[PDB]
Amino acid sequence: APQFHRPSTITADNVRALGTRGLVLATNNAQFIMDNSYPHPHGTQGAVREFLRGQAAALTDLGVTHANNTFAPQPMFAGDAAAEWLRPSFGLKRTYSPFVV
Amino acid sequence: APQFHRPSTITADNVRALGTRGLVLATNNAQFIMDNSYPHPHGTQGAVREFLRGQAAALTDLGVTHANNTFAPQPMFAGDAAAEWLRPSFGLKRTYSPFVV
Amino acid sequence: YATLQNMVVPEIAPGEECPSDPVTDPAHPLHPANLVANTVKRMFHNGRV
């Protein structure tokens, strides 16, 4: 359980335990006054590295809830094929809508 | 079942017996390591010659499953007609919609 | 030639019309359900025709 109003509560497990939708609400409904009695031991800028790693992993969560909605990531570029001595490799310009009915 | 990481495996009958849709994912799930322990007996250029003759023979098998979708192909150009001494040899500008409802 | 005879052709339903739109109809061969890596009807969609 993280609490945003203090520096030394946020860890890597505390960001990823809440998803993308819930992190919209709890950060928009947090405390204005920042406490400073016991800061983050790696400095107050060290936890900036600690939170935001959980965001790009939080759409890998939303990638799984939409794995039944989006498509498998095809290689966007060439050079990525198991056989290159008889057939070439394309790469899909992913202009398409990842969308499964 | 041909193995696409070995040149001495692919024959014409291994590609033709595999379907056209099954030929797509079989070439994409091969091995990145190219084996050189048993090359093709007609050389590495000859293994390219053997593989692609089975794909064009599979287009004829694809035309059988879509024979209830298109029509009989009319002769395209001049000089080919049964009775030529009273009527000429016609030929279609094939811009229509070959489609069977 | 190895990627001209390389495409995804779905079988038409019995009693259905021809697919005309790649965006909506999933039986269309240029639909995003059919756009596989390393193929030409997806290269019909990478270069949009």
Curated annotation (Swiss-Prot), chain C:
Q: Where in the cell does this protein reside? A: Virion; Host nucleus
Q: Which family does it belong to?
A: Belongs to the herpesviridae major capsid protein family.
Q: What does this protein do?
A: Self-assembles to form an icosahedral capsid with a T=16 symmetry, about 200 nm in diameter, and consisting of 150 hexons and 12 pentons (total of 162 capsomers). Hexons form the edges and faces of the capsid and are each composed of six MCP molecules. In contrast, one penton is found at each of the 12 vertices. Eleven of the pentons are MCP pentamers, while the last vertex is occupied by the portal complex.
Q: How is the subunit organization of this protein annotated in UniProt?
A: Homomultimer. Makes the hexons and eleven out of twelve pentons. Interacts with triplex proteins 1/TRX1 and 2/TRX2; adjacent capsomers are linked together in groups of three by triplexes, heterotrimeric complexes composed of one molecule of TRX1 and two molecules of TRX2. Interacts with scaffold protein; this interaction allows efficient MCP transport to the host nucleus. Interacts with capsid vertex component 2/CVC2. Interacts with the small capsomere-interacting protein/SCP.
Q: Please identify the protein, giving its name as recorded.
A: Major capsid protein
Q: What gene is it encoded by?
A: MCP
First and last residues shown, out of full length: 836 to 884 of 1374
